[PDB]
Amino acid sequence: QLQESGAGLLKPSETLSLSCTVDGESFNGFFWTWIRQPPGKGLEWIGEINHLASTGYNPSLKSRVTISVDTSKNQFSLKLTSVTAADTAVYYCARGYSYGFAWPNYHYLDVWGKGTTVTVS
Amino acid sequence: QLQESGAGLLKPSETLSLSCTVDGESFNGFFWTWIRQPPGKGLEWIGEINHLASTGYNPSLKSRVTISVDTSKNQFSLKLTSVTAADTAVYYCARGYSYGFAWPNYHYLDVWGKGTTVTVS
Amino acid sequence: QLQESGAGLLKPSETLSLSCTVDGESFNGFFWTWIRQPPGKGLEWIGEINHLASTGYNPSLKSRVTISVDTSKNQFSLKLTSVTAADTAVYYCARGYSYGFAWPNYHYLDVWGKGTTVTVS
Amino acid sequence: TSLYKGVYELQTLELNMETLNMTMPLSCTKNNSHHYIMVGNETGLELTLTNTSIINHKFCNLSDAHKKNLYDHALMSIISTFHLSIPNFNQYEAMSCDFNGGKISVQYNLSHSAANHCGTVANGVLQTFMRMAWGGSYIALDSGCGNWDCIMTSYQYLIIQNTTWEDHCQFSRPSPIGYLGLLSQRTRDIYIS
Amino acid sequence: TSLYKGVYELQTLELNMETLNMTMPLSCTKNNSHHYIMVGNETGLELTLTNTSIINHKFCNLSDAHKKNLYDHALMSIISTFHLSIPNFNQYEAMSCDFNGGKISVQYNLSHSAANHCGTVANGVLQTFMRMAWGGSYIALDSGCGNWDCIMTSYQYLIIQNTTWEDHCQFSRPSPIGYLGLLSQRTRDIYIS
Amino acid sequence: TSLYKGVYELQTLELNMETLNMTMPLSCTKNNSHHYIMVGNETGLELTLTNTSIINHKFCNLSDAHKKNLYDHALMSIISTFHLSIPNFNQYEAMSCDFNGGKISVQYNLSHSAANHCGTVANGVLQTFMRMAWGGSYIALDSGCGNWDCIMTSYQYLIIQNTTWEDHCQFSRPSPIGYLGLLSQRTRDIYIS
Amino acid sequence: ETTLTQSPATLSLSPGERATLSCRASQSVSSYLAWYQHKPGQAPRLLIYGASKRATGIPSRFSGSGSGTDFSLTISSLEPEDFAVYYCQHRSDWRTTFGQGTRLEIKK
Amino acid sequence: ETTLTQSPATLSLSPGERATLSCRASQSVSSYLAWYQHKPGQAPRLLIYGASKRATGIPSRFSGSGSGTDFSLTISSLEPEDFAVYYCQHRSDWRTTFGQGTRLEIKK
Amino acid sequence: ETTLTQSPATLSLSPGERATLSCRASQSVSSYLAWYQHKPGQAPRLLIYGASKRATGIPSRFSGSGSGTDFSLTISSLEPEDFAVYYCQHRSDWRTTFGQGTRLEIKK
Amino acid sequence: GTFTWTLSDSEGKDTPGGYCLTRWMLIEAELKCFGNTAVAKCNEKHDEEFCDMLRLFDFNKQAIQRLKAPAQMSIQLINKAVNALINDQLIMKNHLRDIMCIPYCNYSKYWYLNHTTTGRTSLPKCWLVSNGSYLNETHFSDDIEQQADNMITEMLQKEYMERQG
Amino acid sequence: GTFTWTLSDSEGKDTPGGYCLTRWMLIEAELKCFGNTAVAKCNEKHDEEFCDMLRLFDFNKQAIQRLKAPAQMSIQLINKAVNALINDQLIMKNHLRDIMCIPYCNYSKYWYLNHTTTGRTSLPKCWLVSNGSYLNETHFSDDIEQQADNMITEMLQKEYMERQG
Amino acid sequence: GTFTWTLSDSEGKDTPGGYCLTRWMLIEAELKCFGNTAVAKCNEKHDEEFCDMLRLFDFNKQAIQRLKAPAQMSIQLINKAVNALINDQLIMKNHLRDIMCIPYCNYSKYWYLNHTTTGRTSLPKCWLVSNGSYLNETHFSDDIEQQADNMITEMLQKEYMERQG
Ligand SMILES: *[C@@H]1O[C@H](CO)[C@@H](O[C@@H]2O[C@H](CO)[C@@H](O[C@@H]3O[C@H](CO[C@H]4O[C@H](CO)[C@@H](O)[C@H](O[C@H]5O[C@H](CO)[C@@H](O)[C@H](O)[C@@H]5O)[C@@H]4O)[C@@H](O)[C@H](O[C@H]4O[C@H](CO)[C@@H](O)[C@H](O)[C@@H]4O[C@H]4O[C@H](CO)[C@@H](O)[C@H](O)[C@@H]4O)[C@@H]3O)[C@H](O)[C@H]2NC(C)=O)[C@H](O)[C@H]1NC(C)=O
Ligand SMILES: *[C@@H]1O[C@H](CO)[C@@H](O[C@@H]2O[C@H](CO)[C@@H](O[C@@H]3O[C@H](CO[C@H]4O[C@H](CO)[C@@H](O)[C@H](O[C@H]5O[C@H](CO)[C@@H](O)[C@H](O)[C@@H]5O)[C@@H]4O)[C@@H](O)[C@H](O[C@H]4O[C@H](CO)[C@@H](O)[C@H](O)[C@@H]4O[C@H]4O[C@H](CO)[C@@H](O)[C@H](O)[C@@H]4O)[C@@H]3O)[C@H](O)[C@H]2NC(C)=O)[C@H](O)[C@H]1NC(C)=O
Ligand SMILES: *[C@@H]1O[C@H](CO)[C@@H](O[C@@H]2O[C@H](CO)[C@@H](O[C@@H]3O[C@H](CO)[C@@H](O)[C@H](O)[C@@H]3O)[C@H](O)[C@H]2NC(C)=O)[C@H](O)[C@H]1NC(C)=O
Ligand SMILES: *[C@@H]1O[C@H](CO)[C@@H](O[C@@H]2O[C@H](CO)[C@@H](O[C@@H]3O[C@H](CO)[C@@H](O)[C@H](O)[C@@H]3O)[C@H](O)[C@H]2NC(C)=O)[C@H](O)[C@H]1NC(C)=O
Ligand SMILES: *[C@@H]1O[C@H](CO)[C@@H](O[C@@H]2O[C@H](CO)[C@@H](O[C@@H]3O[C@H](CO)[C@@H](O)[C@H](O)[C@@H]3O)[C@H](O)[C@H]2NC(C)=O)[C@H](O)[C@H]1NC(C)=O
């Protein structure tokens, strides 16, 4: 029913600057998630953000990554400064949910984008 | 019955520095007013001050004029820095009152000084 | 029953740095007092300190003397910077008490150390 | 008089609530633009509804007011009681003071903006006022009764100042009730910090 | 019915405490993870006990919340009433807010450390909660009764947010009592600064 | 005994207000220089009127006192209740503390200047004291009764510290009334900021 | 803010004739206008305040009224002594202005 | 913090056989693990959440359970279409991780 | 602040005679003075406190009294062992001073 | 009106008799009216849940009918009215009874006695609850009989005074 | 004294009978004394304006007479006394009645009944006001008759007990 | 229980009769029980020191027995209970009487009357103190006789109703 979609480019230096445009359904009810998959590797989490711009990040990227939200366009853009050879990965933007009520609780990412490939050549 | 009186001098540069000594009746019940009349012009308001040193000023003089009060001598002195060719006017010191009660209200200046002539030659 | 005891050295320059080790009985119930006696002079007070490190000092030494307490070793050390020819005195460490209740009240120093001699040669 | 049941005269008392000045503040109203609170036979406060202001700035230097102690303690107590009773006082730019020399002058800015959008500043200030001068306040504000929550007047400022004792009462009998009414329920409708 | 003394039928009334919404807030409980306070037939607050958080920082910008006035006054009054009723609230790092745009979301961190060492944060927050949602709160917290001073739950966060009116009541009848219970005794168990 | 009306013996009860220690604080007086508040059979506070001081500075680091939580909660509650009950406490330089390690010592400076000019600091502090130790406080201050507003003593300092439980009562029976008397009317005579 | 305009900059009647000087505001006037009489070499004197109050020493020859944005000064007979300069005065909270000034002249 | 480990990095059965993929946590898991299926060239798809919920479009072939530190993904018959890569997902307040990834392979 | 003065800087009696050493304050003394005995080469010893208290190990030979600004140390018979140096001590809140010191001498 | 309501209204009498609870005030019920004797009793009671609620309901009736609030609930009206409408001792009492595990009033259902003839009724008393449910009559049948004895006593006293007057 | 005043004084009896209001306490009046029965009634009333004022007046009498304040009004005495002198419910009640446009008490004039013989009197009740003026008797003649009936009833009950004793 | 305690407990009846004070509750005394009539009187009294203390003592009994506080006194229980347990007017009243130099109650000893036969007793009233000591009977013998008259009156009224019923 819903489909998330972003944009990006190959980026040899500077900042990664990826963007994700959210579909029109329930922007404020979910945790916006950015993940990464370098060739030869499994999935990595980059960070997450909600509509109040409350965020959390993978500590290894704390000094380089800042995730922003702009609710007036249901669009949140990934940001990764000092992009390098180790960041040559496919990036994905996904919608997540955490049922923190009673017990058992749960978490998942349901609607996924198609994947943006970024290299630094 | 009452008569306000000031002092001043011709003042080519620096600061205007005019002084007004208040008569002995009801210093704290009135708004002290400074006005100006350049030759060829009508009356202009400079600013006003009360006994709590609460003031208001003509915006065109905001950067040059500061009106002070010293209640321990019922004397308030006009101050106008960077005095110039455009300030060559007769200055007057007057007592004002505003009846801000019910409706209609009103305002006037009743006791007037005689006028101090200041030029910048 | 109780005996206070300190340590020190002859000290030509720098800082006096005297130490007093308190006996095991009631550290927190008394005002710790430092006094001085230069040859040819009577007794002088340097300053006093309690267990909350609340202090008072002889004003003439305000710029040079700081008295410290370390309750974890029942040891308080005198400190006097810029030590000079006028500080060539016997120093004593004593326990004091002030009965500030009803009337008459009183104050005294009961347990005394033996005296530390410090010169600046 | 009216002989209720043929045997009971209907008689009245009126209390001389003036003799109470030695122990408790008494308030009363002069016309509609002047309301007074006396704290004995020497001094008191004037509360006026005006369309002019005395103070043209945004400072109320309460810290200095208390570092020094040049003010009458009862008069300061009354100012506090009035101030702390204003509900939902979220806008502090509306209050200015001149606590210099022990003199007290406190202004509350009742200006809108938006009137129809009631419940901002003027409402809470005027509701507090109606209790402090209760019984002599009914002609000071427009639209008496009607609502409880959109209290408004034609006046832009409420100004409270220190004065001398004079009888000062012409519209209402002096009464301790206004002050006492705001003595209790001192801490209500307070927003977090 | 039961004919007490052979002549008195035992009969009952149940009060429709819904018609009271026009004048006073009403609270009720949905399951155990959701508690609501309505302030009329339009809006209200949701109070939830959750194991997730929305706000991942330590700021509650109350000064800005009041410089601007974009918030509903009744909803802010209720948040204040809840907050100021928390006894011994010495730890302020436990409270975070997002008062931006007039929107209200307030979080209280109930995490321990040490649970057995009760009476720190979660206890005071949960005790306040039990009064605000009183009568529908008894299944929300564990160890109901037992003690009065070691109130704990399995949940790490109490989150209060602004919402829309919907019936929202399935576990308890709507009641004005919770709010009213915290209206009085507003200033108790307050530590000096 | 006295046989009132020839048929009624006049008999007495005296209440053992000691058994109340499990639920509520009890206060009593030793001579005139020592007043105690117990919070159970383990610890409590000593309140003394002295002509010496422990703290020779002007700091009371309440913010740090609460950032850390090393203090007994009941004892802090009592200190707050005492402090917040002091009317018109405009002079804060009169209060100093040492909240380091969880230890509590609080001093109030009762020194004049001007005594005849009563109602500054010592009066409010001593009036609060007379309620906290009520019934055993009547011999601690001079000029008992006489006025209500010029309460003075020969002592320069009121010092409150944490101690251990000992019987500690020789001048008055233990009583919950002093503490309870200051529990209510917690927020009165408060100056604006 | 608000301003005042006095349209009849120069008005000429012989002494003994009745005349008026109008004054208009840009906005409904907060408060009421005051009028001043000024002589060539002295000081301004309050003539009328609150649109219609004549104060004390001012003769009955001077009167006036106004409301809204439209005010007027009436001199009932123009005594020769009154042929000088008149000004409008308007005060708002902490701000005040004056009109341009209008002058009376004697003609033959 | 916590981590996940998936021991069966490579698992090989013919299509039609039943198989499972285990997943272990370093600490009792806060919450429950989710499983994802990934294809070589597409995007990850949620397969199971909360240890046992199959969501919507996922066929009955996929199930699972777990508690504590020990979780497992069960594929009832390994349809040829399912022979790709699986991952464990775990979320703590504001933090989340993934397992290493395990792969299924068809043998002859 | 306050100071102490001891007038009898040198006092000489034979052993066995009774003698006193006076001490005066500049202001009514806050509290009461203490007296110390000092020997040439040891440490000061508390002799009397609170004007009249003899403490413990101090013999009955030593007594004293005082009030206001005027205090005095009395030695009932001057034992030869007591012919040394005496000092007044005064403490105010967080401040204290000493007198100049007076000395006893044996004459023949 | 004759019950001297400590309310913003002075005329709480819609019809002769006690205060009536109408169709919109009761759940799954129509109109239930109590006599004036029973209602008047609350004039001097400082420990009764039922009349604590009558004060809030009557307050609301008047607050809605006479004054108008343009937007929101204008919550300040209740915030300043409650100290005069509600006996706080009752809320605190029932809260304490709840924390201590004994039956308490949560202000929902009330039990009253209604005589088979004359129609005389007693004031409703709160139907107490514990452990998520209402107590059965067995647990408080003693309280119901005391109330029945009180109604009988009052009727006999009334007859006595009619005989004397 | 016999009215067990919730005041700082224990002896409020200047003369046998009720509390008296003297020349300086009343406006344009001399001395008016009420009997002890009427005054004693306020011992248990939690809804009466007249005796709320008697408590303030008697408090003031004692506060002035026994303790002395060297300067100012020493306002702290009233600030800490009021919760025990005044039934706050009454102030809030009358304030609410005022905001809602119905007659309310502003504590000025009080109406009482005085029997043409014996001199028995009732407690004064507040003369309510609305729209800037006092209400005419017509508007509350019903309340005056209820009070008259109550006085009659009490006299008859007194006679009954005298006959029994 | 039958005294409808404004307490956290609902069953304050340990034995038929009034509330009893046991060996650990009284100083240098064993068990003293009052009848139910005297205790029931406090159900409607808003000016009585003795029953203000009964509420604290009974509260403490229950607070200790039913709920457990692992450490410290968990002082919050009293801080939130007092407004419902104590009539603050009484503390403020006695404090004011003390500052104004008249006899006041410091809640220690209480005087009661005990009939030589039947064993009927009155509610204890506070034994007032002044200038550091208890007042002698001479100073309040008048109050003791009024209480004795009240006991006699009540017994006669009881007999009257037994004769009527
Ligand atoms: C003092 O304490 C007492 C004792 O604890 C409290 O008493 C309780 O109060 C609650 C709330 O008023 C009562 O719950 C209501 O009960 C209705 C009857 O069904 C329920 O009870 C039966 C039998 O016990 C259960 O079998 C039902 O549960 C089953 O069905 C529900 C359906 O949703 C499921 O959720 C369950 O899982 C079960 O399958 C019920 O619990 C019940 O109908 C009512 O729910 C309807 O009404 C509410 C009103 O908001 C709606 O939110 C809800 O969605 C339902 O609405 C439907 O019907 C209406 C028409 O009537 C339509 O308009 C809607 O669109 C929709 O189709 C609610 O569950 C509880 O029974 C009662 N306990 C006792 C012992 O009496 C007091 O409240 C408390 N008082 C105070 C002041 O604190
Ligand atoms: C309302 O106001 C009234 C009126 O003011 C107050 O009434 C007073 O309350 C106090 C405290 O309860 C009573 O004091 C107690 O009295 C006991 C009896 O001896 C005392 O009175 C006699 C006669 O008046 C005096 O001669 C005694 O004084 C002499 O002896 C004492 C001994 O210490 C010396 O200190 C004095 O200098 C005199 O030499 C007494 O004043 C008295 O025994 C009791 O003291 C014992 O008990 C306390 C309890 O904590 C101990 O702290 C203390 O150390 C004593 O304990 C010894 O004995 C016990 C066994 O019983 C052992 O276990 C201990 O180890 C130890 O050996 C205390 O002094 C006062 O009498 C009473 N006044 C009147 C007129 O009745 C009300 O309290 C007040 N109520 C409220 C609620 O505010
Ligand atoms: C409003 O309050 C202020 C502050 O209390 C009042 O001003 C003060 O008035 C007193 C006199 O009542 C002044 O003290 C004395 O004045 C005499 C004058 O001859 C002088 O000889 C004495 O030595 C002494 O100074 C006080 O200085 C003055 N303070 C200030 C700040 O003005 C003011 O009068 C009150 N307002 C009204 C209307 O009364
Ligand atoms: C929680 O509170 C916030 C703040 O009040 C709510 O958001 C606000 O919703 C209103 C509409 O109810 C918005 O105003 C209007 O929106 C329409 C939309 O078409 C627009 O055409 C109007 O011009 C006007 O802007 C308001 O802007 C919006 N503010 C914010 C900060 O979002 C929020 O909806 C509440 N939560 C829930 C669940 O209702
Ligand atoms: C006034 O309050 C302070 C703070 O609570 C009290 O000092 C504290 O006393 C406890 C023991 O009661 C100390 O904890 C334990 O001490 C033992 C000593 O052997 C040690 O083995 C344990 O590991 C543990 O540390 C605590 O550290 C100490 N804290 C401070 C700041 O001193 C003080 O005793 C109270 N005053 C009076 C008169 O009791």
Numbering used by the authors:
A (entry chain h), B (entry chain H), C (entry chain J): 3 to 9, 11 to 30, 35 to 59, 63 to 72, 74 to 111, 111A, 111B, 112, ...
D (entry chain A), E (entry chain B), F (entry chain C): 59 to 171, 176 to 255
G (entry chain L), H (entry chain l), I (entry chain K): 1 to 29, 36 to 57, 65 to 72, 74 to 80, 83 to 109, 114 to 128
J (entry chain b), K (entry chain a), L (entry chain c): 260 to 424
Can you list sentences taken from the study reporting this PDB entry?
While the majority of observed 12.1F-GPC complexes feature 2 Fabs to 1 GPC trimer under saturating conditions, 1 Fab to 1 GPC trimer and 3 Fabs to 1 GPC trimer were also observed. While our previous observations and 2D classifications suggest that 12.1F typically binds in a 2 Fab-per-1 GPC fashion, applying C3 symmetry to the data enabled the best resolution of the epitope-paratope interaction. Amino acid residues at the epitope-paratope site primarily interact through hydrogen bonding with the residues past the β5 sheet and before the apex-associated α1 helix, with the HC’s CDRH2 loop providing the most notable amino acid contacts (N57, L59, S64, and T65; IMGT numbering). The LC’s CDRL3 residues predominantly engage with GP1’s S111 to contribute additional stability through hydrogen bonding. The 18 amino acid CDRH3 loop of 12.1F, while in close proximity (<4 Å) to GP1, only weakly associates with GP1 amino acids. Instead, the CDRH3 makes extensive contacts with the apex glycans despite the small variability observed in Figure 2A. The HC interacts heavily with the N89 glycans, and multiple aromatic residues (Y108, Y110, F111.1; IMGT numbering) engage with the sugar moieties. The glycans we modeled contribute 59% of the total buried surface area between the Fab and GPC with individual glycan contributions of 547 (N89), 191 (N109), and 33 Å2 (N167). We observed density for the fusion peptide of GPC bound to 12.1F in two conformations: (1) similar to unliganded GPCs and (2) similar to 18.5C-, 37.7H-, 25.6A-, and 25.10C-bound GPC. The results can be reconciled by considering the angles of approach of these mAbs, as we observed the 12.1F Fab engaged at a steeper angle relative to the GPC’s 3-fold symmetry axis, which presumably causes steric impediment of matriglycan engagement.
The LASV glycoprotein complex (GPC) mediates viral entry and is the sole target for neutralizing antibodies. In its mature, native form, GPC is a trimer of heterotrimers comprised of the receptor-engaging subunit GP1; the transmembrane-spanning subunit GP2, which contains the GPC’s fusion peptide at its N terminus; and the stable signal peptide (SSP), which remains non-covalently complexed near the membrane-proximal region of GP2 post-cleavage. The GPC is expressed as a single polypeptide precursor before being proteolytically processed by signal peptidase (SPase)21 followed by site-1 protease (S1P). We present the development and characterization of prefusion-stabilized, trimeric GPCs of LASV lineages II, V, and VII, revealing structural conservation despite sequence diversity.
